[PDB]
C-alpha cells in the first residue's frame, strides 16, 4: 500500500465520481484491488488512511457516486468510502 495505490482506486473512479460519465473496468479493478487485493493489515488500515485524502481531494465531486463506487465493482465492504469511517478498528 501506498497513497498511490489508493489513487489507482479513486483516480480511475473520479471520471465518474466527479463527472458521472461511466464506470470503467479500471475504476472497478482499482477499487476491488484496494479492498480485496490489499491483502495485508497495512494494506487495510493504512490504505483507508489514504482514502481519506483521496476522497478528500474531491473537487466538484458527487457524494452519491462515492457509495456507488464499491457497488459498481461488486465489493460490498464492511467499512465505507466515508472520509471518517475509522481506519484502525477495521482490522
Notes on the protein architecture:
With 91 residues, the chain is mainly alpha-helical. It has one domain: Hydrophobic Seed Protein. It is 51% helix and 0% strand. It has four helices and no strands. It starts with 6 loop residues before the first helix and ends in an 18-residue tail after the last helix. It holds the Pfam family Tryp_alpha_amyl. Belongs to the plant LTP family. It comes from Vigna radiata var. radiata.
How many domains? The number is: 1
Which descriptor suits the 3D outline? Answer: globular
Element order, helices and strands?
A: HHHH
Question: What is Rg?
Answer: 12 Å
Number of helices: 4
Largest sheet: none
State the end-to-end CA separation: 15 Å
Strand content: under 5%
The CATH superfamily is known as Plant lipid-transfer and hydrophobic proteins
CATH architecture: Orthogonal Bundle
Annotation, overall tally of beta strands: 0
CATH topology name, in short, is Hydrophobic Seed Protein
* Helix content percent band: 40-55%
Q: Which CATH first-tier class would you pick?
A: Mainly Alpha
Oligomer: monomer
Structural class: mainly alpha
GO molecular function, one term: lipid binding
Family: Belongs to the plant LTP family.
Keywords: Antibiotic, Antimicrobial, Disulfide bond, Fungicide, Lipid-binding, Transport
Disulfide bonds: 3-50, 13-27, 28-73, 48-87
Amino acid at each position: 500500500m501506498t497513497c498511490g495505490q489508493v489513487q489507482g482506486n479513486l483516480a480511475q473512479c473520479i471520471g465518474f465520481l466527479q463527472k458521472g460519465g461511466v464506470v470503467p473496468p479500471s475504476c472497478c479493478t482499482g477499487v476491488k484491488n484496494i479492498l480485496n487485493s490489499s491483502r495485508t493489515t497495512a494494506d487495510r488500515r493504512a490504505v483507508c488512511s489514504c482514502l481519506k485524502a483521496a476522497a478528500g481531494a474531491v473537487r466538484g465531486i458527487n457524494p452519491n457516486n462515492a457509495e456507488a463506487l464499491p457497488g459498481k465493482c461488486g465489493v460490498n465492504i464492511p467499512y465505507k468510502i466515508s472520509t471518517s469511517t475509522n481506519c484502525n478498528s477495521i482490522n
